[PDB]
Structure 1
Amino acid sequence: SISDVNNAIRENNVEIAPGRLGDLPAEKGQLITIPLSAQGQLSSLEQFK
């Protein structure tokens, strides 16, 4: 049903949330903090098909 198609398009194109490594509170002795992101969106036609 159309609900299935809409739900699949919702879930596969998800917009994962950005985050950071080594954020406060932090362990003793942490010297490096780096932002990290994950791509979860469909890019072009091929993935959608």
Structure 2
Amino acid sequence: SISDVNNAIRENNVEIAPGRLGDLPAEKGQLITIPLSAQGQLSSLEQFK
């Protein structure tokens, strides 16, 4: 049904929110903190197809 297509679009094309390594509160002795990035959205016709 149409709802199935809508759910497929929702699940396959989603926005992810990765955090950070060393994010506060952080363990003692942590010297490096670096953000994390992940692309969960589709950006082309082929990907949606």
TM over 0.5: yes
Aligned length: 49
Consecutive unaligned residues in structure 2, runs of 5 or more = none
Give the C-alpha shift of residue 18 in structure 1: 3.7
Percentage of identical aligned residues: 100
Where does structure 1 differ by over 2 angstroms across 4 or more consecutive aligned residues? Answer: none
CA-atom RMSD in angstroms: 0.9
CA distance in 2, matches of 1:11, 1:42: 11
CA distance in 2, matches of 1:8, 1:14: 10
Q: Deviations over 1:2-48 (max 9, x none)?
A: 00000000010110114211011111110000111111111200010
**TM-score computed with the length of structure 1 as normaliser:** 0.90
